[PDB]
Design a protein around this nucleic acid. Structure first.
Ligand SMILES: C=C1[C@H](COP(=O)(O)OP(=O)(O)OP(=O)(O)O)[C@@H](O)C[C@@H]1n1cnc2c(=O)nc(N)[nH]c21
Ligand SMILES: [Mg+2]
Lengths: 406, 553
DNA sequence: TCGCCCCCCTTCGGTGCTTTGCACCGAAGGGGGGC
């Protein structure tokens, strides 16, 4: 084969990101994986005269107990040329979110049969560390389409359509969406008749080279106001500040007549009887909260953002938007490990589920705003990561003023 | 001899040419020592004469060696380094003796003149051009270039490491049960072979290094304990640091104090309880390294405490993979922590300390979480796993923290251990307002241009107060308003502010702060019995908040 | 009058916020130690 010419974006240099420490089991796994890859010519040993580097680590899944090597090419992807500017990018199908059940398959290995442009390989270097720094790091670069590089699905694009044709041929209403190294494959078949055709796809994929998702239950959780029939000054203050915030999202919500029920310098536990003009305002704004907002539409030229709040008892609320206060989706993720004693696990799993939903719904992951200290996240997240992709994220520290989403 | 290893190609940064800088004066002893190496270097092909077509130049010097007889040559390549391509450094960290296992037979070897046995890219040599001056000006200099890795060049350490790795790998794969710690040219070689076969393996390794041009002189071939290694001393059953000598001085400069704190930090890996908070405070707000700084009374005490700790003999032990690692932390005060890592009681693998202040406002529970994180990372680096923790915090306390704090947080498997002072929450905010307690509506405003402001309150019991403030900010006046309400209320209070800022700081339950004003608020929160803290949006005419807002106006 | 790596402590400067200072963060200064 002859390679495709690839470029970084104008004025950008390749990645230069330090390797972080790894446990014994992950270092041994990487050493086993890479030496086999080196023997098959998929990677090459390089030295320190290549000035580029990207962190590497490994994950092992809940029901495939072999290690998967994972290279965090987030920085490399950010600097790589667009492939819709070369228009070899993949289109997202609006059918996938409508399906009964969607199974994720890791088809990363198909990339290893296509060589990478000789002049772009240096940008793909990574370094395996050493327990107790017994040796210097050991460095490799790829000779083929790397797992995790955004250009690999685009270059391999024309070929996956060829390998897929007979399947989508024979099953015209199964929908298959490539995202990075993953195939998202949905159908309306019964819970276990769907599974067997997933096995059929595996065999056709094998002839050359997670769990079941249910999009119907991805219930949206809207803003809700409490129901009491005794209401204190404090109850009405917390309700007025909550709707005042929601006035930035919705239209025609007002507070001045719930607002004057508290006129005067009152005690926070005094019980204010509700005006009929207050019940006028309240049952009114309840129903605006009841249905979605009008005028919010997805725009593919802009990025997706996701915000998460810890609510406790293992509940986690989230919003996905592109423009502030124009949420494309609000929701609530629920823990289920059973021990229910680990916030970092719950949050890491919530990020995977939210990002999964974005791929199914819009075709790409959002940039997360994570309610956690950077260094707490960094100490523990990889122990819980199970996806072959990694989303962009930043770290935020905003206390709740309102418990808007609860 | 020079290795027949292939050279690693090296480039200048794009656009740049090589250095062109004239040479300076050195002493007579320096010229003779340098000429002996220079004439010998040319004899062994380390350098070659050049002349005037080569337009580049760089200046040269020498420095004394810990082996007192020898002299070490260095050329000042600061300019060439600036123009040389970036390298990805492969030395990721420093091996630690607590990460060694017990070994039956141990050897330590050193490669002599290691840089000078690794050849340099042919096309790159012309940029290493230099001149040797002999005295002041009897002659000008003769010109040489390097055929090998020069000392002082940005790329030399990495091309030595890469070269050493290539030469060692055959021997490593052929003897998987021989530990080789490779740091620069220093080789630690341990094994569970009887001394007879062990020494067969060593000479076999040494003869492999010599074929590739790395000689190992007997002078630096250690074969009996105690081995000198990486600044430590390795015995069969234990290890020590080489002696740490602290400055003792009548009058201290900033630079002196900086050297002392560095020594103490080095000592902390094996001496438990070391503290540097009061000595480092003296470095703050200073302006010259030669400025004399008098020790405060607190810094004298802390110094004396450390000096008592250092007069005691200490040792670490080696790692037993068949046992768990255990990490215990104690609290020392003013944001300082110390820790020990061990496998059997009273037999420390190592110690250390954590004492960073992260943020302007924090509490002991956050900092304890940070110390845990530092220890977890350190254990991964040295042993490849995290330890089990023994922590002076009750499960009730931690559980109160991660349910009332809004950020995700965690600590791994840990056992409570009762070593006061315990880590505590110093107050908790009520989740509901308090019946019978007074209700304060607080607010403060400042004028951004003016820098003048007021803080005040109104209450459900009919109380009011306005205080003028000078040289303040918007955020300070809000903090001040909360200060006043805590000051004039009883042991139980309900407070309503319109400052998301102030609510945000206080809801995180801080117990220390870089701000004297926030610290004052903290002491008042600790003295209260119950406090409920509520927010409302400003300027929406809300009962209470609107009355005070107007009062502050 | 040198190079490369790790660590700590202090300082400084850039970024972003429904900001007008404030809090965060990384880099660069000093020190320790290694070869
Ligand atoms: C680690 C190093 C090798 C092994 O250091 P080394 O102690 O084993 O010295 P070397 O093998 O050369 O001589 P020896 O083993 O015969 O005694 C040396 O090549 C050079 C390098 N190094 C050490 N210190 C310095 C220094 O300050 N400035 C520079 N630029 N480089 C230095
Ligand atoms: Mg040597």
């Amino acid at each position: 084969i002859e390679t495709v010419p690839v470029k970084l974006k104008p004025g950008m240099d390749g990645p230069k990101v330090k390797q972080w420490p790894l446990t014994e089991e992950k270092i041994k796994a990487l050493v086993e994986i890479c030496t086999e890859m080196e023997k098959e010519g998929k990677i090459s040993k390089i030295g320190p005269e290549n000035p580029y580097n990207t962190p590497v680590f490994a994950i092992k899944k809940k029901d495939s107990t072999k290690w998967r090597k994972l290279v965090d090419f987030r920085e490399l992807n950010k600097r790589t040329q667009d492939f819709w500017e070369v228009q070899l990018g993949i289109p997202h199908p609006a059918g996938l979110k409508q399906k009964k059940s969607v199974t994720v398959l890791d088809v990363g290995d198909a990339y290893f049969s296509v060589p990478l442009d000789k002049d772009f390989r240096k940008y793909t270097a990574f370094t395996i560390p050493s327990i107790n720094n017994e040796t210097p790091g050991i460095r490799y670069q790829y000779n083929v389409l790397p797992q995790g590089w955004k250009g690999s699905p685009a270059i391999f694009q024309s070929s996956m359509t060829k390998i897929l044709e007979p399947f989508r041929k024979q099953n015209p209403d199964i929908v298959i969406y490539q995202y990075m190294d993953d195939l998202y494959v949905g159908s309306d078949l019964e819970i276990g008749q769907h599974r067997t055709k997933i096995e059929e796809l595996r065999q056709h994929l094998l002839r050359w080279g997670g769990y079941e998702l249910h999009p119907d239950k991805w219930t949206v959780q809207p803003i809700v106001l409490p129901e009491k029939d005794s209401w204190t000054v404090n109850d009405i203050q917390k309700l007025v500040g909550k709707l005042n915030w929601a006035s930035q999202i919705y239209a025609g919500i007002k507070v001045r007549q719930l607002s004057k029920l508290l006129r005067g310098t009152k005690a926070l536990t005094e019980v204010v009887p509700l005006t009929e003009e207050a019940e006028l305002e309240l049952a009114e704004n309840r129903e605006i909260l009841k249905e979605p907002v009008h005028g919010v539409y997805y725009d593919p030229s802009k990025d997706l953002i996701a915000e998460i709040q810890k609510q406790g008892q293992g509940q986690w609320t989230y919003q996905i938007y592109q423009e502030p206060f124009k949420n494309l989706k609000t929701g609530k993720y629920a823990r289920m490990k059973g021990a229910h004693t680990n916030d970092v696990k719950q949050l890491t799993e919530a990020v995977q589920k939210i990002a999964t939903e974005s791929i199914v719904i819009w075709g790409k992951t959002p940039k997360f705003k994570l309610p956690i200290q950077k260094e707490t996240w960094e100490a523990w997240w990889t122990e819980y990561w199970q996806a072959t992709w990694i989303p962009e994220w930043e770290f935020v520290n905003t206390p709740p003023l309102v418990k808007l989403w609860y | 001899p020079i290795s027949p290893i292939e050279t690693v190609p090296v480039k200048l940064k794009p656009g740049m040419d090589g250095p062109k800088v004239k040479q300076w004066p050195l002493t007579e002893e320096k010229i003779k020592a340098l000429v002996e190496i220079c004439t010998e270097m040319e004899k062994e092909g380390k350098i070659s004469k050049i002349g005037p077509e080569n337009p580049y130049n760089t200046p040269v010097f020498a420095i004394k060696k810990k082996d007192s007889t020898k002299w070490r040559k260095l050329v000042d390549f600061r300019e060439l380094n600036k123009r040389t391509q970036d390298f990805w450094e492969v030395q990721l960290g420093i091996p630690h003796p607590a990460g060694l296992k017990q070994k039956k037979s141990v050897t330590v070897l050193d490669v002599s003149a290691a840089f000078y046995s690794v050849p340099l890219d042919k096309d790159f040599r012309k940029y290493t051009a230099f001149t040797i001056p002999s005295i002041n000006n009897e002659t000008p200099g003769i010109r040489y270039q390097y055929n090998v890795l020069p000392m002082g060049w940005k790329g030399s350490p990495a091309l030595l490491q890469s070269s050493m790795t290539k030469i060692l790998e055959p021997f490593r794969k052929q003897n998987p049960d021989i530990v080789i710690y490779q740091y620069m040219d220093d080789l630690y070689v341990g094994s569970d072979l009887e001394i007879g076969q062990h020494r067969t393996k060593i000479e076999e390794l040494r003869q492999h290094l010599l074929r590739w041009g790395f000689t190992t002189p007997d002078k630096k071939h250690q074969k009996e304990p105690p081995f000198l290694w990486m600044g430590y001393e390795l015995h069969p059953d234990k290890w020590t640091v080489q002696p740490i000598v602290l400055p003792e001085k009548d009058s201290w400069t900033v630079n002196d104090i900086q050297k002392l704190v560095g020594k103490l930090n080095w000592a902390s890996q094996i001496y438990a309880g070391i503290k540097v908070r009061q000595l480092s405070k003296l470095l703050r707000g200073t302006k010259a390294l030669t400025e004399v700084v008098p020790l405060t009374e607190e810094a004298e005490l802390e110094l004396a405490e450390n000096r008592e700790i250092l007069k005691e003999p200490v040792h670490g032990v080696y790692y037993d993979p068949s046992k768990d690692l255990i990490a215990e932390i104690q609290k020392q005060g003013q944001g300082q922590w110390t820790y020990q890592i061990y496998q059997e009681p009273f037999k420390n693998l190592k110690t250390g300390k954590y004492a960073r202040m992260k943020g302007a406002h924090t509490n002991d529970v956050k900092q304890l979480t940070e110390a845990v994180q530092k220890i977890a990372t350190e254990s991964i680096v040295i042993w490849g796993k995290t330890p089990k923790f023994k922590l002076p915090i009750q499960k009730e306390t931690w559980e109160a923290w991660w349910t009332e704090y809004w950020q995700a947080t965690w600590i791994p498997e840990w056992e409570f251990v009762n070593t006061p002072p315990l880590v505590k929450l110093w107050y908790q905010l009520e989740k509901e307002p308090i019946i019978g307690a007074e209700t304060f509506y607080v607010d403060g405003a400042a004028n951004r241009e003016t820098k003048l402001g007021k803080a005040g309150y109104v209450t459900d019991r009919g109380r009011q107060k306005v205080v003028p403030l000078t040289d303040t900010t918007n955020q300070k006046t809000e903090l001040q308003a909360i200060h006043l309400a805590l000051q004039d209320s009883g042991l139980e209070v309900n407070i309503v502010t319109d400052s998301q800022y102030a609510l945000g700081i206080i809801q995180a339950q801080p117990d220390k702060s870089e701000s004297e004003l926030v610290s004052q608020i903290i002491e008042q929160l600790i003295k209260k019995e119950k406090v409920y803290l509520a927010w409302v949006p400003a300027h929406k005419g809300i009962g209470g908040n609107e009355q005070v807002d107007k009062l502050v106006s």
